Amino acid sequence: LDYLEQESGTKHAREM
Amino acid sequence: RTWKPEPDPMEEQLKQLAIQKAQLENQKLQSEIALNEAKVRAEDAKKDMTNLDYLEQESGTKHAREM
């Protein structure tokens, strides 16, 4: 899950 | 002639417990193989995460997201 979120930019999107 | 060798309760049981022990040992080995496979999968996931972190750092994606 952490790899998919990092690859898809979901973490970056949620950071903003 | 009419002599039936009496069975020994103890010596009887012990054998049943030894059979149970053998079965339990086989199940223990199976569980150990399962655990080793699970650890292999976990290490593969960690390797994938490390590869992702290396690619992001090399390509500057981390720097881009930092801004």
Automatic annotation (TrEMBL), chain A:
Query: What portion of the full-length protein is represented by this chain?
Result: 660 to 675 of 760
UniProt name for this protein: Portal protein
